[PDB]
């Protein structure tokens, strides 16, 4: 299992120790408070009122937690995933990333604390 | 395992099928959007800017998800719990509840979708 | 989880730290060598050639590992149980017992090493 | 998870659907009766009285269940493995095999029924 922090201003994302392999079932729980610029902060589902202006993940709100598995496209994580299996052909290291517009991470603040484990399968 | 919705306006809380027994390890993931009255909605961590005016759980924000186990006091759940063990002497059915002030649930809206499972132990 | 030895000559059985609760899923693996009297020894499935002359469990061979859950009747364990759920209304402490005829345990020898854990549910 | 039979006369072994990956925790439970030639049958720990005359696994008795993971050497399974982690650098498909001397499998009989699952990690 892995536990760590994902900083909102880390555009490259936070690599974890988790390698997702075919057939794996995983659980993720994410908590905490972060911002994509404003003084306000949002949880790992992000800001439901803010328009998408070029987010790295168009399937989650700005300020949400997302991930990549190997070199997949971004996949929403939000508050977490319960006993989840990846789409076919998706495998490799899990990288966690705050959802913002590329080039605009410098004014971000806060972080999410995230646990990831593999479940029985 | 249990999956279901917890309505923000349900003051009695949502009983689940999960009975927490001594030694159990559990995982909860909660998602969604709810309000304790305002037109805005918040995720399962609630509204970090709103003062506590007599919440059923003083250890979580207004609008957060909390629980009771048997007839315990309220315990914060927020976005979820990862491979969690209860305090000594806490056991019984898990009831999930939206954190608001007693008597003020009528103007609440939305709900959280919640998964709960028992982990290996 | 519990790990321990079950002595072949222990007529009362070996109490474990595992309380089986409704809905629990458990796994048991048992290993080792024991005898109900002869110089030979047998593994946890017992002696497939020996007649049942009044065994505590008529659904397993003499010399097999069996169990009780609370005050249930005996249930075969043999080499183990994989992600197993008990019958309806069966619950309580797990006691492991070598299968022999009551009153005839004094000439028994050896033991089984046994792991028991609860699985995800 | 995988469930299947491992025939005692199958010299090449039984390939399973389980690919053991770095960091995986697995559980195996094996049951049943088989023989390496004699009319008698033994359980998955094999025959503790028979000399090793060139077995594929010198760390288990003749007639025991063993495995390979990818192209590893043989590893004893016996009655099973509880929440087990492989040695460093061992990975790949799990193949289950009856322990006998190469070239002598033709007079073998019976089989073991085996479950393998991945555990939480
Ligand atoms: Ca920004
Ligand atoms: Ca309200
Ligand atoms: Ca005896
Ligand atoms: Ca043979």
UniProtKB/Swiss-Prot annotation, chains A, B, C, D:
Protein's UniProt name: PA-I galactophilic lectin
GO cellular component: cell surface; cytoplasm; periplasmic space
Pfam families: PA-IL (PF07828)
The UniProt record lists the keyword Cell division: no
InterPro entries membership: Galactose-bd-like_sf, PA-IL
GO molecular function, one term: carbohydrate binding
Compartments where located: Cytoplasm; Periplasm; Cell surface
Function: D-galactose specific lectin. Binds in decreasing order of affinity: melibiose, methyl-alpha-D-galactoside, D-galactose, methyl-beta-D-galactoside, N-acetyl-D-galactosamine. Similar to plant lectins in its selective (carbohydrate-specific) hemagglutinating activity.
Keyword Phosphoprotein: no
A single BP term in Gene Ontology: heterophilic cell-cell adhesion via plasma membrane cell adhesion molecules
Alphabetical UniProt keywords: Cytoplasm, Lectin, Periplasm
Protein family according to the UniProt entry: Belongs to the LecA/PllA lectin family.
């Amino acid at each position: 299992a892995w536990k760590g922090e994902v900083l909102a201003n880390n555009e490259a994302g936070q690599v974890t120790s988790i390698i997702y392999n075919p057939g794996d079932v995983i659980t993720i729980v994410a908590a905490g408070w972060a911002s994509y610029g404003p003084t306000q902060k949002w949880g790992p589902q992000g800001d439901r009122e803010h328009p998408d202006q070029g987010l790295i993940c168009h399937d989650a709100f700005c300020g949400a937690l997302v991930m990549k598995i190997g070199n997949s496209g971004t996949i929403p994580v939000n508050t977490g995933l319960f006993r989840w299996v990846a789409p076919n052909n998706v495998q490799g290291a899990i990288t966690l990333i705050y959802n913002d517009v590329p080039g605009t991470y410098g004014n971000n603040s806060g972080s999410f604390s995230v646990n990831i484990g593999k479940d029985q399968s």
